[PDB]
Amino acid sequence: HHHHHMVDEILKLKKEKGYIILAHNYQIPELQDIADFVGDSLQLARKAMELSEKKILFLGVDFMAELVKILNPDKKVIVPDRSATCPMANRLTPEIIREYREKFPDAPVVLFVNSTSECKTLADVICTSANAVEVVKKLDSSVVIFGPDRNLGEYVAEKTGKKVITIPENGHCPVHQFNAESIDAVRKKYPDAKVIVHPECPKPVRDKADYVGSTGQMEKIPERDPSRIFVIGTEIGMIHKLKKKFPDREFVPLEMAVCVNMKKNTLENTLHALQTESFEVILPKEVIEKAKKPILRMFELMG
Numbered sequence: 001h002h003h004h005h006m007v008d009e010i011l012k013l014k015k016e017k018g019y020i021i022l023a024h025n026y027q028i029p030e031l032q033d034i035a036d037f038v039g040d041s042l043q044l045a046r047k048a049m050e051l052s053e054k055k056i057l058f059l060g061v062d063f064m065a066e067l068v069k070i071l072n073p074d075k076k077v078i079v080p081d082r083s084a085t086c087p088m089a090n091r092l093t094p095e096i097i098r099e100y101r102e103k104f105p106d107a108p109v110v111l112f113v114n115s116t117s118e119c120k121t122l123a124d125v126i127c128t129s130a131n132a133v134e135v136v137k138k139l140d141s142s143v144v145i146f147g148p149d150r151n152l153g154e155y156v157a158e159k160t161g162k163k164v165i166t167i168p169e170n171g172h173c174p175v176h177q178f179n180a181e182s183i184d185a186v187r188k189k190y191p192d193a194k195v196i197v198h199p200e201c202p203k204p205v206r207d208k209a210d211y212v213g214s215t216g217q218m219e220k221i222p223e224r225d226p227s228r229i230f231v232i233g234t235e236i237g238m239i240h241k242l243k244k245k246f247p248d249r250e251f252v253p254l255e256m257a258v259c260v261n262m263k264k265n266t267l268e269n270t271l272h273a274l275q276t277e278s279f280e281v282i283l284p285k286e287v288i289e290k291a292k293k294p295i296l297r298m299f300e301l302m303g
């Protein structure tokens, strides 16, 4: 295979230099295939608490790389592209969080994992798409401040019956803005297919799906649902993941949806990262100390 040179050297350098490679489900297939662990944000966060390797190469976006670092302050965490980020986070700021705390006195602040580490220092609890409902359900409050994703917060409100105040204004993931007409059309094309969508999708898409869940939840659905065809409403990288796990099922994208930031990582720049052991993820010690609290609370509210 024509990529063999990069694949072979990545595997050699990872072993020689003592790295574990963690990747998100939206990474390109070629990178998923060289990673030691590929999962959703919650699975990556849990893996980050467990792993023993002294050095971590993380393949995803910066806020998750930083979460890995927060949980492993004394390990070296590197990423191949230091600009890979989630655009939804930048609109959420400390000033907005403090404004809303005052506006809603005793409402806990629940931040989605795609948020700056600075913002996480101000959060009561972190969540991911997988556990947001569970986290908010278990909190001792009928009102929560939630951000940055409005769709996820609205889904949480539905599922919990609680008041969810979303910050900032119109925070959303462009990748998951499918139109529900795509579900109508695929219902006609494949009448027995099951439609699985991400909770970051807008409400009419969520409401027309058979299942709503994180990418890790999506991967578990075929363990219990014997359907021959699944239609997948999330970023295109998950198709490869699902097809690998379940070669005897068919996975159809709801629409083509690409996260440009997730695609910044390539075989070439991942090789360069292992050659140079760059770019290290570095945070102020104060940020680690403060942000770890709501991250650890997330795990306390699950189990």
Ligand code: SF4
Binding pocket: 061, 085, 086, 087, 088, 114, 173, 174, 175, 176, 200, 235, 259, 260, 261, 262
């Ligand atoms: S897919 Fe959406 S929410 Fe996830 S990193 Fe990309 S822009 Fe952010």
